Design a protein around this ligand. Structure first.
Ligand SMILES: NC(=O)c1ccc[n+]([C@@H]2O[C@H](COP(=O)([O-])OP(=O)(O)OC[C@H]3O[C@@H](n4cnc5c(N)ncnc54)[C@H](OP(=O)(O)O)[C@@H]3O)[C@@H](O)[C@H]2O)c1
Ligand SMILES: NC(=O)c1ccc[n+]([C@@H]2O[C@H](COP(=O)([O-])OP(=O)(O)OC[C@H]3O[C@@H](n4cnc5c(N)ncnc54)[C@H](OP(=O)(O)O)[C@@H]3O)[C@@H](O)[C@H]2O)c1
Ligand SMILES: NC(=O)c1ccc[n+]([C@@H]2O[C@H](COP(=O)([O-])OP(=O)(O)OC[C@H]3O[C@@H](n4cnc5c(N)ncnc54)[C@H](OP(=O)(O)O)[C@@H]3O)[C@@H](O)[C@H]2O)c1
Ligand SMILES: NC(=O)c1ccc[n+]([C@@H]2O[C@H](COP(=O)([O-])OP(=O)(O)OC[C@H]3O[C@@H](n4cnc5c(N)ncnc54)[C@H](OP(=O)(O)O)[C@@H]3O)[C@@H](O)[C@H]2O)c1
Ligand SMILES: [Cl-]
Ligand SMILES: [Cl-]
Ligand SMILES: [Cl-]
Ligand SMILES: [Cl-]
Lengths: 264, 264, 262, 262
């Protein structure tokens, strides 16, 4: 007795997955490859990026192309679009800004954060949405942050840039959904990525605590009692990119184990 | 070259799907049956309910049991729980309250709406959540309404009862997610169900317009330019019920084609 | 200086559940702006004392209704004393905390009656007169838990969220006729009830009252509890002729404790 | 009657972009409560006239700074005139409407500079003094579009939402030191700019001004546009000593037009 399970309907489509050699972006890449989506993946570090592409090719039956570039620069965006001029799916992602107190920031800190986490996604949407509209199908997913719903004092630069992206997305989403293009944001709370692990160990050593003690501290503030996985993050991305999600647009899906306490 | 696609991981589990011989509830039932979930489906009208169960059995490889009862009464809830004492998945649903002006309502109108669309789901959660916790897995999905986010003047009884359910769910969701139980709400905007079609035709005849003219009027207020399908509603339900959604809880997923204009 | 004239002197306000705490703060602030009052509470001697104090401090009239506002006969008593209010402040005691697995159907109905249907019915009874006169101000005291429900407050989370969704729909319907409906959502305010509850939970836990107060206050970014005076001041502003473009609002007075952007 | 004393007589407010419209309404309302003002705008003759009018009506001092507040030298001019404000009202002109497919990178940067980074930098320059004095009130004029973005307002949707998320984080950090940071979100207010814009879009479309006004007003449940006086009254209330438990709030003054519950 075999069960049909869920065919997301997007085999043969193409996705441009930004910032995706590791972490959540890689989780989205893998989940889309398993649905038969051909990939162009972007990251800055060439040897890690090509290793990830090797591995996804082995693990899936799709094509994978790589672009080694800084997606937050004009030249990097041009290189990504040269390699993937007409994506059906765009996953926006880039490294987040540094923590600190805004009184200690220079103006250029704001500009860099706005470029990386707001204007870069907007520009890649600008560059790709008309082809999606012309084909009657498009899926744009922006990786943002649970901080959009509950800003953290020390993350001023992210609170601002990502809330700016979110406000822009809300307006555009309603304009293009009738042409078959959806635009939605995935808001991760704390996910078990290598970057998070590296940061945790540095923070433990700076406080004098063991890594286990600091891990437990973070987890106690998450009702789910665990960190998120890049796999379940990628699964939600793949569902938003599916033919079953064409009525869902401008949404901000919070994947945070219950941590944020608001009703909405 | 066959693609893995998405295995929701819930084959062999059991779902109690309320109010599910037709419409959105039937859409959830079918989507769960395709993932290999055995069903107990509830509705009041026996012959329609048994026809739906016949059809789902033919269409899927799962078992389907029926309970013909009014789920908004104590006896009906008891009959549903006798038939499905330990569900892994609970889909809460029931008919919505009548439209009108609250100045014309009697007290009993409020009580009936609160019973049907708030206390009935709470009681079925009360009756089933401890077994979910004991097994380390539970998925509760409540069908509510886009009105929760943007209340309509003439839907006072739904605005109130469903917002009450939503507030209760937000608090409980954070309490049980660490035990493997999630509780989330699906907020439909306008979906193409037989009830909606019947209501539209009555409204057209009461206004003197053709059905096509009234259909178009409603659609012009939906940016997606179409009504929702019970299939895509069921797909979102199945994804929330999957092993890929254990980090998602207390959320209010709006499936409305962009119609509600808020950022959040 | 031309200080702020809220323009409501000589209007009449029905202030529910207002011999003490936040309701009393609303009554004091409205009387200070010249509003004649009818104040409701169950316990006669506290009610009369509070009325006497307000009347002596403000020279408005202050009628009292000793009744349980969450019952139909109580609402009839209150409406008989104030059949045509310009201003209605909805308020009543809150439901008991606990685990929803231990709440009966009747517990749910009591909470819904007290904190959702009672305000709806008082609005139902008074709004058409406000409309007819081209002015009305309805303020519902709810709870910061409407924005961030706590698991132990299931009954409040449900009933007050229901009121909040109802209010959202009605507010838009009547604002063009000069009636606004807004909710005030208190976080922790230093009412005598809260103070007594703290001192009991202190001596119960074996810590002092000051120790428990510090624990509560650590979770409030403003570093203090709210005062009934500032709660009443916000209510008076909503009631003013300056607030007729403000409706369906949920003003959080919680010292920044709720973390959400919205 | 003891009318409402907001307790801010003799404080000093820096009011940005305030020779006309909502900023002017804020300045008028604060002066009426005894607050000394420094008001900023670009055009000298309008700025002086508005200052003269406020000074004559309120007997506070009203200094003027003729500058473009969205440039670094403009901010330096404003801060030189008002280095230690108790109250800061952030405001500037809004960005142009249009299709984001036609906006350049520089268009985005101009909007972000004008409606997000300018207020952040003015907060950055003034908040530590507020903290040191144990009192501060920061009010940011944003837009009802922050709650419901319009596709033609992409630049505003982005920049003002960014400011709003930044403010949410900072508000909780400083409220314990007596500083509140809140946003006022206007829906359609009858400022002379709006009126002129309407009369041009009227004669352009071939309809009269009254016809276009009726079309706009049909979509506002309150049935009217807002007034700068009531906008300024809300700003003054937030600035008061009664509003120290209110921070990080986004008060929608839009006559009920926005349909959301929250
Ligand atoms: N993980 C969480 O708990 C969490 C929570 C909230 C928000 N977020 C946000 O989500 C995003 C992803 O986080 P993550 O933990 O998955 O990060 P990650 O583990 O560090 O992965 C980032 C990936 O993007 C690439 N990349 C980074 N900056 C890039 C750039 N300018 N151009 C091109 N590729 C770039 C990195 O490779 P190269 O370094 O080789 O370029 C790597 O492949 C970040 O913006 C983060 O702030 C994450
Ligand atoms: N469809 C939309 O556009 C839309 C939008 C917003 C909200 N909603 C809400 O979503 C829910 C589902 O709507 P729908 O359009 O799918 O409704 P539907 O097409 O009428 O289906 C309702 C189903 O539930 C059963 N049912 C109704 N009341 C019941 C009760 N007391 N006990 C047991 N079974 C019951 C009905 O069969 P019997 O009559 O035989 O019992 C039928 O199987 C409603 O609460 C509705 O108000 C729907
Ligand atoms: N203070 C806070 O921190 C806070 C925070 C969140 C929510 N709230 C909610 O705000 C409301 C007011 O709280 P509070 O602290 O001001 O309470 P309070 O100090 O206990 O004052 C309650 C007032 O209402 C009267 N009252 C209570 N139930 C009544 C009824 N059924 N009929 C008529 N009068 C009634 C009481 O007098 P009698 O007993 O003589 O009738 C008293 O005058 C409550 O619902 C509470 O749950 C308060
Ligand atoms: N009124 C509404 O319906 C409404 C609704 C939503 C949002 N908003 C936003 O609220 C703000 C105020 O709107 P309003 O209608 O009050 O505008 P207004 O009537 O045009 O007033 C703008 C005031 O700011 C000054 N100003 C503008 N840009 C400036 C700059 N760069 N530096 C210094 N002063 C500057 C103007 O004088 P100068 O030109 O001489 O400098 C004038 O005194 C705008 O950002 C607008 O987009 C307003
Ligand atoms: Cl830490
Ligand atoms: Cl209609
Ligand atoms: Cl405690
Ligand atoms: Cl127009």
């Amino acid at each position: 007795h075999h069960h049909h399970h869920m065919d997301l309907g997007i085999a043969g489509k193409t996705a441009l997955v930004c910032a995706a050699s590791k972490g959540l972006g890689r989780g989205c890449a893998e989940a889309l490859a398993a649905e038969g989506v051909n990939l162009v993946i972007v990251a800055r570090t060439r040897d890690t990026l090509e290793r990830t592409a090797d591995e996804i090719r082995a693990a899936s039956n799709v094509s994978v192309a790589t672009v080694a570039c800084d997606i937050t620069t004009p030249d990097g965006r041009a290189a990504a679009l040269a390699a993937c001029p007409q994506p059906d799916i765009l996953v926006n992602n880039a490294g987040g800004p540094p923590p600190g107190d805004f009184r200690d920031f220079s103006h250029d800190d704001w500009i860099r954060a706005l470029e990386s986490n707001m204007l870069t996604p907007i520009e890649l949407i600008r560059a790709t949405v008309d082809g999606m509209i012309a084909r009657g199908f498009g899926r744009i997913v922006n990786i943002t942050s649970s901080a959009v719903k509950a800003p953290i004092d020390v993350l001023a630069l992210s609170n601002g840039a990502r809330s700016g992206l979110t406000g822009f997305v809300a307006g555009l989403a309603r304009k293009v959904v009738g042409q078959g293009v959806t635009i939605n944001n995935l808001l991760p709370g704390l996910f078990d990525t290598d970057r998070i692990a590296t940061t945790l160990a540095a923070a433990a050593n700076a406080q004098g605590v063991t890594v286990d003690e600091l891990r437990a501290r973070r987890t106690r503030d998450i009702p789910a009692g665990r960190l998120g996985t890049r796999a379940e993050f990628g699964a939600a991305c793949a569902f938003l990119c599916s033919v079953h999600a064409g009525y869902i647009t401008g949404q901000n899906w919070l994947l945070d184990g219950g941590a944020y306490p608001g009703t909405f």
